[PDB]
């Protein structure tokens, strides 16, 4: 009978290592995210260089894009477990959507702005 | 003729936020009847599970097999679709069944939210749509059945370039699956919309529309005539000459864009390779020779700056004639 105590307490144990797991993963996530924000940047050689540079910003972008969707996959199967927390997730999902599109069409502008150089 | 199984429910009433774990982890046992219809049997197990599921919007998926049960015929009558099922039983194990929402109800909730939401709401939904289709391909047939394509077009045609580009990435997700592919082959309005999209000012959107149209013409050849007819209908409805959008890309108002130019030439090439009729062929090539095509081709084949792959596919053009 004493086991069912051990059981509920194991339920609390499994949820504790659960979000300790969420936290250690998130560490790397933060680093990646930080970098995502970082790569940002608001002559004719220069324009061309910019299109060729923003082209590597995005070669790197899609490069990291595979573990980035690993991140979207992990987050969706993350909030599967677990009121306060939800808004937090939504907040990073919207912030990252805005900077996903934002570096998408900022590199697009840099390509299409040495297009104004070509 | 009774059956003892392992049961679990799946909380999917909201498809834009599906949970991942079925509860409980340790599936409970209860006894059914193999020769009686399942509909009347669903309530005992539904209360057995205490699920927060609209019992009257529910559906059943065989866990390992994935089969969606017809809810009002017995177990013995759909035996031909449960081969792997009775073999698990025959092994003396208990097979597992997933309680979830009908694909119909889920696609219905989706069409509601697409038709009734807007702004940030609508946008979030479209991004997730991609991954949702990757991971349950089974929604795609019910989707085509509920005019979900009507919804997608009816939304995309009054939206901005990001909203439309996201729609198109999602749409490619649909077309990796057979049923969605079949829905696109059926819906002339869709391909018409993609042609309209080839005139977008977003050069990303144009590349994307172009590459999906390539996917469309590469799947089969039976849809080359359907394409050409859709294009004629769009050019005719819009007041522009047929095919004007591609050749406008070809004679570049903005300048050079090798990836789009090569994509376009391969597209028209791969449109050419699928017809034995030389007479409609000649009809069309007159319609093109009218617009000035030969000088554009000639002067571009002159300049040595053209990229080698683009050049190979355009010599495939010339070699055809």
DSSP structure string for B196-215: HHTT-S-HHHHHHHHHHHHH
Q: What is the 3-state secondary structure (H, E, C) of chain A?
A: CCHHHHHHHHHHHHHHHHHHHHHHHHHHHHHHHHHHHHCCCCCHHHHHHHHHHHHHHHHHHHHHHHHHHHHHHHHHCCCCCCCHHHHHHHHHHHHHHHHHHHHHHHHHHHHHHHCCCC
Of A79, A104, A118, the CB nearest to B255: A118
Q: In sequence order, what are the residues at sequence separation of 6 or more whose Cβ sits closer than 8 angstroms to the Cβ of residue B275? A: B224, B281
- Residue A44 included in any domain: yes
Neighbours of B28 (CB within 10 A): 12
Sheet of B96-101, strands arranged across:
B29-33, B2-9, B96-101, B58-62
Q: How many helices (H) and strands (E) does chain B have?
A: 16, 4
For B163-200, give one letter per residue: b (16+ CB within 10 A) or e.
Answer: ebbbbbebbebbbebebbbebbbebeebbbbbbbbbbb
B256 with A76: Cβ contact below 8 A = no
> What is the C-alpha to C-alpha distance for residues A69 and B17, in angstroms, rounded to an integer?
17
Residues in B touching A112 (Cβ below 8 Å):
203
Q: Exposed (0-12), middle (13-18) or buried (19+): which is B150, by Cβ within 10 Å?
A: middle
Q: Exposed (0-12), middle (13-18) or buried (19+): which is B18, by Cβ within 10 Å?
A: buried
Q: State both tokens at B263.
A: 């994509």
> What is the C-alpha to C-alpha distance for residues B168 and B202, in angstroms, rounded to an integer?
13
- Residue A24 included in any domain: no
- Residue A39 included in any domain: yes
CA B205 to chain centre: 17
Domain that holds residue A66: 29-114
> What is the C-alpha to C-alpha distance for residues B85 and B273, in angstroms, rounded to an integer?
47
B120 with A94: Cβ contact below 8 A = yes
Interface test with chain A among B123, B126, B258, by most A beta carbons within 10 Å: B123
Q: In sequence order, what are the residues at sequence separation of 6 or more whose Cβ sits closer than 8 angstroms to the Cβ of residue A90? A: none
- Residue A85 included in any domain: yes
A108 with B203: Cβ contact below 8 A = yes
Give the gap in angstroms from C-alpha B208 to the nearest C-alpha of chain A: 13
| Chain A residues whose C-beta sits inside 8 Å of any chain B C-beta | 69, 72-73, 76-77, 79-81, 93-94, 97, 101, 104-105, 108, 112, 115, 118
Of B17, B124, B255, the CB nearest to A115: B255
Give the gap in angstroms from C-alpha A71 to the nearest C-alpha of chain B: 12
CB B227 within 8 A of CB B216: yes
Of B127, B204, B254, the CB nearest to A108: B204
Residues 144-183 (B) with a CB less than 8 A from some CB of A: 162
Query: Comparing C-alpha atoms, which of B225, B234, B240 is closest to residue B283?
Result: B225
- Comparing alpha-carbon positions, the chain B residue that sits nearest to A70 is B131
CB B226 within 8 A of CB B191: yes
CA dihedral B157, B158, B163, B166 (to 10 degrees): -10
Compute the Cα dihedral for A53, A55, A61, A64 and give only its sign: negative
Could you give the number of structural domains in chain A? 1
> What is the C-alpha to C-alpha distance for residues B321 and A47, in angstroms, rounded to an integer?
41
CB B217 within 8 A of CB B185: no
DSSP structure string for B118-183: -HHHHHHHHHHHHHHHHH-TTHHHHHHHTTHHHHHHHHHTTS-HHHHHHHHHHHHHHHTSHHHHHH
> What is the C-alpha to C-alpha distance for residues B279 and A34, in angstroms, rounded to an integer?
61
Radius of gyration (C-alpha) of chain B in whole angstroms: 26
Q: State both tokens at B212.
A: 């999906």
> What is the C-alpha to C-alpha distance for residues A79 and A89, in angstroms, rounded to an integer?
8
A108 with B256: Cβ contact below 8 A = no
- Residue A90 included in any domain: yes
- Residue A86 included in any domain: yes
Residues in A touching B123 (Cβ below 8 Å):
97
Residues in A touching B164 (Cβ below 8 Å):
none
Of B20, B131, B257, the CB nearest to A80: B20
Interface test with chain B among A10, A55, A75, A105, by most B beta carbons within 10 Å: A105
B204 with A80: Cβ contact below 8 A = no
B19 with A104: Cβ contact below 8 A = no
Give the gap in angstroms from C-alpha A35 to the nearest C-alpha of chain B: 22
Give the gap in angstroms from C-alpha A77 to the nearest C-alpha of chain B: 6
- Comparing alpha-carbon positions, the chain A residue that sits nearest to B23 is A81
Q: In sequence order, what are the residues at sequence separation of 6 or more whose Cβ sits closer than 8 angstroms to the Cβ of residue B217? A: B223, B224, B227, B267, B270, B271, B274
């Amino acid at each position: 009978t004493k086991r069912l105590i051990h059981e509920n307490q194991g339920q609390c144990c499994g949820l504790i290592d659960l979000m300790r797991e969420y936290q250690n993963l998130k560490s790397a996530v933060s680093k990646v995210l930080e970098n995502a924000s970082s790569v940002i940047v608001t002559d004719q050689e220069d324009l061309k260089w910019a299109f060729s540079k923003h082209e590597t910003a995005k070669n790197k972008m899609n490069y990291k894009q595979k573990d980035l969707d690993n991140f979207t996959s992990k987050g969706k199967h993350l909030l599967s477990e677990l009121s306060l927390v939800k808004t937090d997730m939504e907040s990073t999902v919207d912030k990252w959507l805005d900077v996903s599109e934002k570096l998408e069409e900022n590199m697009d502008r840099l390509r299409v702005s040495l297009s104004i150089w070509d | 003729s009774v059956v003892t199984v392992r049961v679990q429910y799946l909380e999917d009433t909201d498809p834009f936020a599906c949970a991942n774990f079925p509860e409980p982890r340790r599936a409970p046992t209860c006894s059914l009847d193999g020769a009686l219809p399942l509909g009347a049997q669903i309530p005992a197990v539904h209360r057995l599970l205490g699920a927060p599921l609209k019992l009257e919007d529910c559906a059943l998926q065989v866990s390992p097999s994935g089969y969606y049960l017809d809810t009002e015929l017995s177990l013995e009558e759909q035996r031909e679709m449960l081969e792997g099922f009775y073999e698990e039983i025959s092994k003396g194990r208990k097979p597992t069944l997933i309680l979830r929402t009908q694909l119909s109800v889920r696609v219905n909730a989706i069409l509601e939210k697409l038709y009734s939401s807007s702004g940030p709401e609508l946008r979030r939904s479209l991004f997730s749509l991609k991954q949702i289709f990757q991971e349950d391909k089974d929604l795609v047939p019910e989707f085509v059945h509920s005019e979900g394509l009507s919804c997608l077009i009816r939304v995309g045609a009054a939206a901005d370039h990001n909203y439309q580009s996201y729609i198109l990435r999602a749409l490619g997700q649909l077309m990796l699956f057979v049923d969605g592919m079949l829905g696109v082959v059926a819906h002339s309005d869709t391909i018409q919309w993609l042609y309209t999209l080839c005139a977008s000012l977003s050069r990303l959107v144009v590349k994307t529309a172009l590459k999906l149209l390539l996917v469309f013409v590469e799947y089969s050849e039976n849809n080359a005539p359907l394409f050409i007819r859709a294009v004629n209908s769009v050019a005719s409805t819009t007041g522009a000459p047929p095919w004007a959008n591609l050749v406008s890309i070809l004679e570049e108002k903005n300048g050079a864009d090798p990836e789009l130019l090569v994509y376009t030439v391969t597209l028209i090439n791969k449109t050419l390779a699928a017809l034995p009729d030389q007479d409609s062929f000649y009809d069309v090539t007159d319609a093109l020779e009218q617009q000035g095509m030969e000088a554009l081709v000639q002067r571009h084949l002159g300049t040595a700056g053209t990229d080698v792959d683009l050049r190979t596919q355009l010599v495939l053009y010339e070699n055809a004639l």
